[PDB]
Amino acid sequence: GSGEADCGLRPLFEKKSLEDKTERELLESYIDGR
Amino acid sequence: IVEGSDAEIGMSPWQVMLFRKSPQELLCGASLISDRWVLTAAHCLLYPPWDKNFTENDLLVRIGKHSRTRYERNIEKISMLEKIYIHPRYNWRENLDRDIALMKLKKPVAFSDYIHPVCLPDRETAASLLQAGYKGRVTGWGNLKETGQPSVLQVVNLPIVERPVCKDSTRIRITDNMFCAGYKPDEGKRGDACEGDSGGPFVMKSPFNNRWYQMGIVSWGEGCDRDGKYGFYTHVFRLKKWIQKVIDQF
Numbered sequence: 001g002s003g004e005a006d007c008g009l010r011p012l013f014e015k016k017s018l019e020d021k022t023e024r025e026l027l028e029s030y031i032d033g034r
Numbered sequence: 035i036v037e038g039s040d041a042e043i044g045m046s047p048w049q050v051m052l053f054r055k056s057p058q059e060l061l062c063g064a065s066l067i068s069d070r071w072v073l074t075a076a077h078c079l080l081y082p083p084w085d086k087n088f089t090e091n092d093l094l095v096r097i098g099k100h101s102r103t104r105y106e107r108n109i110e111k112i113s114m115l116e117k118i119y120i121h122p123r124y125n126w127r128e129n130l131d132r133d134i135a136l137m138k139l140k141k142p143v144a145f146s147d148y149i150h151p152v153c154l155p156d157r158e159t160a161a162s163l164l165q166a167g168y169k170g171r172v173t174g175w176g177n178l179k180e181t182g183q184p185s186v187l188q189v190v191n192l193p194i195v196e197r198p199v200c201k202d203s204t205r206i207r208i209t210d211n212m213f214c215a216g217y218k219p220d221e222g223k224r225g226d227a228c229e230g231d232s233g234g235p236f237v238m239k240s241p242f243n244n245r246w247y248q249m250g251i252v253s254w255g256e257g258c259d260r261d262g263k264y265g266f267y268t269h270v271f272r273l274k275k276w277i278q279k280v281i282d283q284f
């Protein structure tokens with residue numbers, strides 16, 4: 001939509017359900033902790 | 035980047051290096067937002083106090099990189115600039131307000147495992163993700179300390195800081211078009227962007243659709259990773275309309 005389709009989905013990670021070493025540190029902060 | 039660590043392969047496929055033709059050196063960071071457009075900080079191109087004022091032909095855009103100095107044959111893609119657009123109201127004279135610029139590539143770049151565009155935030159996404167305490171990611175090949183350089187692309191995860199706290203850390207006049215990020219003195223952890231990271235992307239991964247969005251652009255700071263001070267970034271969404279305006283017309 002407000003951004004071309006497919007954008008933001010990394011070939012070597014999201015597209016293969018693979019996580020990078022520290023992305024969970026980010027998602028864990030989108031709640032209340034840090 | 036100070037106190038960060040080596041990024042892994044294909045971790046930031048939108049990461050762009052602004053390379054100078056002569057001499058040949060790292061100039062700034064930038065980001066790929068489509069097959070023909072790259073985003074960066076205006077002070078990277080224009081900054082009179084330092085007689086800095088580059089044009090289309092003084093620069094090269096290098097996409098898909100990991101190593102700072104090597105020419106990554108078969109992996110990276112070097113592209114030329116067709117046109118540069120600085121924000122008409124970029125304030126280099128006072129506080130670097132509206133530190134943003136768009137660059138039009140001469141020819142579309144072909145995506146791959148190492149080259150892929152990041153997403154631009156929309157009102158909803160920015161509203162939900164841009165909050166104090168939430169962490170974003172900054173990447174670059176800039177300095178490792180205030181006063182050498184990394185061998186490989188560096189990455190750091192930093193929390194966004196409360197606007198009031200940003201205002202009381204500097205004598206510089208803050209504006210709505212910027213936000214600051216970093217750890218406070220008593221938070222144990224540290225880290226920050228630094229000279230050479232300018233124009234680099236500050237991104238966040240949406241918990242809703244799993245996509246990575248670019249919320250900021252490495253803009254300025256006073257020193258690097260000093261206690262009590264924070265890094266400032268251009269508020270990408272606040273300037274989103276200037277962006278679409280430019281892309282839809284040019």
Ligand SMILES: N=C(N)c1ccc(CNC(=O)[C@@H]2C=CCN2C(=O)[C@@H](CC2CCCCC2)NCC(=O)O)cn1
Binds near residue numbers: 077
């Ligand atoms: N620690 C950080 N987060 C950081 C440090 C430096 C840079 C590169 N950006 C700059 O160098 C810009 C370009 C014009 C000057 N500038 C600054 O950051 C000035 C502050 C400017 C604030 C706006 C008005 C002009 C001075 N400080 C340099 C320093 O102390 O190391 C980016 N981030």
